[PDB]
Amino acid sequence: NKAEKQKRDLGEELEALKTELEDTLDSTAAQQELRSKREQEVNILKKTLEEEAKTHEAQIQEMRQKHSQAVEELAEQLEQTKRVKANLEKAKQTLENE
């Protein structure tokens, strides 16, 4: 899926480069605002990317705690079931001993 999405990005970059080349005549005077605007947009993208990476770390922590809680709950049930099995086995020994 990432390869298919990457193919669209490569094709879009080729079309953008072709249109940007023809706009070289107007880029000489438009760089005064595009430089400050493009730089600000890059900073906004970095903040969004950092937030996405931070959100993934928080989700991983929840999964580690959720998965660990499930294993911990199952472990407690094993101890209770194992302890109950000892009572059943001990009760059977009483019948055989009697």
Add this chain to the structure above:
Amino acid sequence: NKAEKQKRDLGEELEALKTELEDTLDSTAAQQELRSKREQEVNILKKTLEEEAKTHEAQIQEMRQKHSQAVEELAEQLEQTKRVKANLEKAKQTLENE
């Protein structure tokens, strides 16, 4: 394999346009330095984002195996207790009859 082949073919289109414009890149050294640095920064972001996504994705894969193995180990012991309960139930009916 076909997707990777198409990616390499698409990349050749960008190199073809760059070679045809190399004659003008030298004359435009006043702004080519700043534009060239921006292109390298975009490539580093893709590699860092791809490496971060691949590294983060590996963490989820480990959880699907480490946590699953723990649940499978605990589940195996639980199933063993259920089978032992069936055998113990038959002993009670036989011991009570004797």
Add this chain to the structure above:
Amino acid sequence: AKIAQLEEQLDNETKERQAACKQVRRTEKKLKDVLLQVDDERRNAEQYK
């Protein structure tokens, strides 16, 4: 006696299948290596075009 001859045939037939599987996996690796050469050959023709 039939079980003895049948068990021996199963082991011999099973061993033959394992040998064929090894040759299949071996030829697959060679095909993948030769398949990669197509990209290198096509890349040269593409770069020359």
Add this chain to the structure above:
Amino acid sequence: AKIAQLEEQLDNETKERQAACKQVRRTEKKLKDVLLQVDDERRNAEQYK
């Protein structure tokens, strides 16, 4: 009972050995096509070169 299980296992092993037989020819046929495909790509690069 042992003859029934042994006969079923022996029959299944021989079928996977038509399975292994046809699989070997499939990989060999595909390998030959890859060898000729890379050869055609090599000639294409020479023509463009």
